[PDB]
Amino acid sequence: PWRFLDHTSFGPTFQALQSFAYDDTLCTSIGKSQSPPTLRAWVHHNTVVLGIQDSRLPQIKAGIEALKGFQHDVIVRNSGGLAVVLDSGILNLSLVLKEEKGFSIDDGYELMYELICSMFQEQIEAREIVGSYCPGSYDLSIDGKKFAGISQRRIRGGVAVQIYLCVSGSGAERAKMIRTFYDKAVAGQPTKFVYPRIKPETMASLSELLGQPHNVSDVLLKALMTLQQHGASLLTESLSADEWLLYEQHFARISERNEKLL
Template structure:
């Protein structure tokens, strides 16, 4: 049984779509939503969840980014370019979120044999299936020169279009991906390249920050030579899950989940304030 069949076939999944709220909510809220939903799924008060979300003009920094020698100068540059800057409370480095980037969270109950790699492989397999109609080879390996590099960078012809991360809380797992659907991947990369230049200024750093080569990044629209939209990709994502046998139903947050979200949001805001110092 492959990973898609195991997690999707004849399994109930809730679909929560927040892709049209980009102008009205912040990325910190998304992290709080996923944490609250992780707790709900982990405690068996919810079925597995597929959540889609979009944020406008936001740069999410990693905790390590926030400790760069001249990070405030880097942040001021991003803000001058019209971006809101936050620091995530999990691993990873700087990424760009905007209206051309679709974020997807797969939230499921942690099983004893469900390793970190299993979570990555599940998302990778889903994206491979999603892009099957385009006849492209999707690779999962680090793309050197990209921002927020990792062993599960997704690429076509050597150009990165997505990155996968994971959070595990109280028995729940959130496997998250950002998919560059449209726009210029290299322009987004140039933005982060300049951030690092302003935030480091040749000084020694406590970690090896990425030396960005903008040409290593692209959107699916650029890679597939087809004008794609976030909504079209969501539609294809839902079709893919249904074709794999998932029982999908549109859903909203329960009262208990909203209460949990409020608690998680307060916690994340406080942590962000401490990190920003």
């Protein structure tokens, strides 16, 4: 019996940092067998989450200024991946399950991949999209254009497979903002890592790829139906008292490490 956590309908004050605290709390409680596997859906207003490496770029302050120029708040995720965009047209799903023998890193990525393909039941590839921001081995795309990115977080015996799904709007416009971020952050200077060379055309939202408009709720519904059609008993619940304690503690740590990195 899976638990479902709906964090998709809150105001623009609901921060990505809080979201990070939630996934960490879930990994901790599910890792102690005190909580059932959890599906957590979340959405945030205009936010650019930078990776640790992005924050150390030569002209970072100019990069952040540009991003604040796009009316996007900026934070850095400690376990650095690379700059990714978060807005009302981006649905994020976190599948948090118990870490066990035989359930590899790739097993986690594969599970999320299968889940997406089923929600949209042969066109979807799991392949790094060169030219896209936050490129990874498990980028998801159709006709060669990236519409989702996957990452995995493992702490306290819990595994959180996370994905950002570009549901509505233009995938390319989001990329142009990030390209501008790197342009001003790198500024033609040497860097400590191979930053992505953004090619806007290699990214697209599901609405653009499927040829018809979809909103976050439509895609959320698909995931819910797909899970139950596959045997899961989804129950809409809130955190337990102990989880709230872990949440506050996790959020305090996360919130301080972000303020620093900036």
